[PDB]
Amino acid sequence: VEKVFFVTSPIYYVNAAPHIGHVYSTLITDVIGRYHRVKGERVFALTGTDEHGQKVAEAAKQKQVSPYDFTTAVAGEFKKCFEQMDYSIDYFIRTTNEQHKAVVKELWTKLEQKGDIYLGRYEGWYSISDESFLTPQNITDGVDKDGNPCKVSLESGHVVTWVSEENYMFRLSAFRERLLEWYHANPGCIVPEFRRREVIRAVEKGLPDLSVSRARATLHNWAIPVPGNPDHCVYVWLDALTNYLTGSRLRVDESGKEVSLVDDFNELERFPADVHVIGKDILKFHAIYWPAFLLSAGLPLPKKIVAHGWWTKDRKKISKSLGNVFDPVEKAEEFGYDALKYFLLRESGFSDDGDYSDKNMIARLNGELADTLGNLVMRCTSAKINVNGEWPSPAAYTEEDESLIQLIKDLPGTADHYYLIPDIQKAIIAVFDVLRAINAYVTDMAPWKLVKTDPERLRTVLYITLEGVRVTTLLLSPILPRKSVVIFDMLGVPEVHRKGIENFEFGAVPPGTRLGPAVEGEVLFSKRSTE
Ligand code: MET
């Protein structure tokens, strides 16, 4: 029941430089982790890089450098990218890590001791780019790097090749019923629901046994050896999925450096993951293979898998080679880091393929962040309206006052359910519905007129507004981590009241609390042009 809340992103292939997809996945992971830290929970948030395999090894060869130098460099690009995005991830794991390799061999050996690994053959299609085994139903005709006729994945469009190899096989066929029993006993374990239904449909049809090794030549000897068989390398996906178990067993110092691998996951109280964040492209690996490996090894299953969609820009596919780039840092430098995160999390739900455009980014920045949130923060901290620069003591509440108070009191329960699904978009919308109501209340009450006309009434109006802004800001702090600090500083909210479920309560900050110092010229979110 009480354990460290454990949330993960995928670990990303290091065949190419990091891009928006990786940033988005890790963002979602970060937001979920931050919300749980805001509730006062212990959190461990994990991300990293998937560095073995034919895909990564062949990408190294193309650049004409050693896999060790290639992976170290690209991993460094991912780390730097994520530092720049200003996340709060607790550890960055690399599959080349020696302690991860130990955990993989340990798991392999468990699957083997269990009787679930035998020496067999795979003869069939393989997508090197997705490191994915495919049936003939999942391939079709296409053209290759030369424009010659070939076969491609229906899923990804990447070139497929026919593999015929003696491989170690995991008895995935034997886990059909246990997987179905898991899905049904936990009908919230895969999100969104239609992706859950997809997984169930696939497993219902039956599962073939899964190749978990490859001949070493095929992988250019860039992989983890099979314990007891140095001619075979461990399937990159079994290696990769194991990162979640490894990460749950690493003690990390202040620097973010791994200092020690514990023998048993219970010691650190992280495993199993509470939320595995993934893209829709890798659902089968996480919802079918992974729980099967865990069932086999006698390990506990993840509580939830959330699978999101794929971004476009200007209604077209993102690619530098096609002439349509989407650089997060460039966009964050122009519009703001928190604002860019807000947009990515607000514009689209997990069931959708989001679309970025500068038009729409500016519409949300101006309309929601500046006009709704920012305006409201300026109004209730203004020396023109809040003449004493403090949280006033309210007088008697009217029915209209109380209808707004009710929305503010209900908001935390509602945002919370949404964050836990998780459905971050709906959490944001719920908060901003309350911000829109506060603004409309402020417009109705015209506190600027009240200063001269009814100072007693202004106390009430101003207090409710401040408290609404505080509560909405608190719930938005996972989304706007830097701007929420600025807001709290402007409101004079003491540190202790900026986290903890105690402070989801209306009334946490007392009358008399002093506003923070006003800086000359500043605005929270500055609007931008609509050319
Ligand atoms: C264990 S998650 C592995 C994800 C994979 N490396 C990818 O980029 O799709």
**Distance between CA atoms of 372 and 366, rounded to whole angstroms?**
8
**Distance between CA atoms of 13 and 243, rounded to whole angstroms?**
13
Chosen domain end from 218, 236, 254: 236
Which residues approach ligand 1 with their CB closer than 6 A? 10-13, 50, 240-241, 243, 282
**Whether 185 and 251 share a structural domain:** no
The residue behind tokens 């994915």 is 132
Chosen domain end from 356, 371, 405: 356
The residue among 8, 108, 96 whose CA lies nearest residue 56 is: 96
Mutate to test the pocket of ligand 1, among 7, 8, 13, 14 (most ligand atoms within 8 A of CB): 13
**Residue ranges in 299-454 assigned as alpha helix (H):** 328-335, 337-347, 358-364, 375-381, 399-420, 424-445, 447-453
Q: Which atom of ligand 1 is nearest to the CA of 290?
A: 1
**Number of CB atoms found within 10 A of residue 353's CB:** 11
Specify the CATH number for the domain of residue 501: 1.10.730.10
The residue among 304, 352, 399, 343 whose CA lies nearest residue 525 is: 343
**Whether 105 and 124 share a structural domain:** no
- Considering its fold, how many domains does the chain have in total? 3
Resolution (A): 2.3
**Whether 372 and 497 share a structural domain:** yes
**Distance between CA atoms of 344 and 326, rounded to whole angstroms?**
12
Between the alpha carbon of residue 275 and those of residues 36, 44, 46, 387, the distances in Å are: 12, 11, 11, 47
Cα first-last separation, the chain:
53
Q: Which string of b and e fits 439-474 if b means at least 16 CB within 10 Å?
A: bebbeebebeebeeeeeebbbbbbbbbbbbbbbbbb
**Whether 3 and 18 share a structural domain:** yes
- Note down the domain range covering 460: 357-531
Question: Which residues have CB under 8 Å from 154's CB, separation 6+?
Answer: 138, 139, 140
**Distance between CA atoms of 197 and 329, rounded to whole angstroms?**
36
**Whether 368 and 300 share a structural domain:** no
**Whether 220 and 361 share a structural domain:** no
Give the bridge partners for 46, in sequence order. Answer: 8, 91
Mutate to test the pocket of ligand 1, among 28, 50, 100, 306 (most ligand atoms within 8 A of CB): 50
**Whether 107 and 248 share a structural domain:** yes
Half-sphere exposure of 4 (CA within 13 A, CB side): 19
**Whether 269 and 217 share a structural domain:** no
Tell me the two tokens of residue 313. 């820009």
**Whether 390 and 519 share a structural domain:** yes
Chosen domain end from 211, 236, 261: 236
Q: Give the dihedral sign, CA 209/213/218/220.
A: positive
**Whether 130 and 255 share a structural domain:** no
The residue among 203, 345, 191 whose CA lies nearest residue 280 is: 191
Specify the CATH number for the domain of residue 186: 2.170.220.10
Specify the CATH number for the domain of residue 3: 3.40.50.620
**Whether 339 and 363 share a structural domain:** no
**Whether 145 and 228 share a structural domain:** yes
Q: Sheet harboring 210-211: ordered strands across?
A: 132-134, 117-127, 160-170, 210-211
From the CA of 132, how far away is ligand 1's center (Å)?
11
**Number of CB atoms found within 10 A of residue 252's CB:** 17
Nearest-CA residue for atom 9 of ligand 1: 12
Nearest-CA residue for atom 7 of ligand 1: 12
**Distance between CA atoms of 281 and 130, rounded to whole angstroms?**
9
Between the alpha carbon of residue 455 and those of residues 385, 393, 396, 491, 528, the distances in Å are: 10, 11, 13, 20, 36
Cβ atoms of 376 and 465 within 8 Å: the answer is yes
Mutate to test the pocket of ligand 1, among 7, 282, 293 (most ligand atoms within 8 A of CB): 282
- Among left, alpha and beta (phi > 0; psi -120 to 50; other), residue 269 is left
